[PDB]
Subunit: 275 residues, 2 copies
């Protein structure tokens, strides 16, 4: 219980004189006063022993403990006002709002469906340009570590090389934050032409309906202007992590075996670098 | 609209002592897993049918059958709620929330302004990382180059060697090492320092050897204890690069917006040529 609740809870055990002391300490602007026994005594015109008895009636060891604690409450409360600059808060709000917007866009049934497509494919490709090419490389790092045969392609030549060898046991995931990156949209159609399954990640719903096997709507940025937006990868990273978590639970034991084997070779390699 | 738990709660204070014991049972999370037929419930709680019926009528139902029908149907329809997410989904989203919270407590605003000023004052800026940290470096390169910074992203030892050999006192190197021990990054930053460059290490681990660099930025640790369940390794870094970027953009904002917009105009002009 905070100070006011304890004082309030002992108020009616207190004498009229002790209620005057309680009244003083229940004032908001009292925290601004010199709360020594020698100044509170003078201000309230009361004796030093009366303050001690007041603190003990409230369940403290003495006055000094009471007033130090009284200031712990004050200190804890004052630290709850934010200490950050507007600029900082804007950036933090951009992240938290993308979590919230992502959360409201999740279709768990679709994400588990996509997790299954990855598992069912023999070959998985991630297609993306610019900042979305970084997302594609990131996804490969995550999923190769669990044993998936995958590759990340980030230019027309790669998509050309890959789509031309694609078959119906291939799955391509394409990343286009804007939903209109010509090289991504047309490359996914090349892959579809060859028999592959196709997943499009985009922040705009577009006319992709029916065009690809799955279309995943990802968050838009909270900031209107381009120059002030946070990382362009982030809308996609949320969905990479979601699909990943779903995918890991599919035959986890074999996937954990592969991951741990990579880990062991890393430990051994690092030791040899030392020795 | 109102779920059956809310309904029970709202009549709880009207209920008899025995009815309140019945309510307490139905308000428990595990109870939907029991056999909730009146026969089994009466035996379980050692009550009569009538008492169960009286409880259900206190809750505004005609009887227990109506009550339990609703109770169980609300439960089996929760699997259909898109907004009610699984333990896996919540684990991932909490990992992101936890990292935002941890990041927020680690922000040293004076430091990040100091780094943005270093970027502004440098003639050449370099971003070093490998793995996912290399992706953070490539991203930072794109964002700062669009504001006119002369910068490059290096993601392997050959690239570190090419660049450090020609650095001087007007160079700045930002190195990303989430583990705080990546030898190529720590060593390459020390090579850059030997050449007179300023150095900034980003790491989730404040080691003593990090004190050698001009600045060290402490970034967040991950929430999940096991590596295999962690969310993206880029994320601790991305927060701080976005903060630095946001500060840097406000140093001589109009000159930097001119440069960003001039980028934009040059694309449009070539697009007019291509339409011809
Ligand atoms: Cl934003
Ligand atoms: Cl220095
Ligand atoms: Cl995590």
């Amino acid at each position: 219980p905070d100070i006011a609740t304890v004082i309030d809870s002992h108020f009616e055990e207190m004498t009229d004189l002790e209620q005057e002391i309680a009244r003083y300490f229940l004032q908001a602007e009292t925290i601004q006063d010199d709360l020594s026994s020698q100044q509170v005594t003078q201000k309230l015109h009361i004796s030093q022993a009366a303050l001690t008895r007041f603190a003990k009636k409230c369940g403290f060891t003495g006055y000094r403990e009471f007033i130090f604690q009284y200031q712990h409450e004050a200190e804890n409360q004052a630290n709850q006002v934010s200490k950050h600059s507007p600029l900082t808060k804007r950036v933090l709000r951009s992240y938290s709002n993308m979590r919230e917007q992502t959360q409201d866009l999740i279709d768990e049934v679709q994400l588990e469906r996509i997790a299954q497509l990855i598992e069912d494919a023999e070959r998985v490709y991630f297609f993306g340009t610019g900042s979305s090419g970084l997302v594609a490389r990131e996804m490969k790092l995550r999923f190769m570590a669990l044993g998936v045969v995958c590759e990340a392609l980030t230019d027309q030549d790669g998509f050309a090389w890959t789509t031309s060898i694609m078959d119906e046991n291939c799955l391509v995931l394409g990343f286009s934050l804007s939903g209109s990156t010509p090289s991504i949209l047309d490359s996914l159609l090349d892959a579809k032409e060859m028999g592959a399954k196709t997943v499009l990640f985009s922040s705009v719903p577009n006319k992709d309906s029916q065009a690809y096997t799955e279309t995943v709507l990802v968050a838009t940025h909270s900031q209107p202007s381009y120059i002030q937006r946070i990382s362009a990868q982030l809308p996609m990273l949320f969905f990479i992590d979601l699909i990943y978590a779903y995918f890991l639970e599919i035959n986890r034991e074999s996937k954990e075996k592969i991951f741990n084997s990579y880990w062991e070779n890393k430990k051994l390699n690092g030791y040899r670098r030392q020795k």
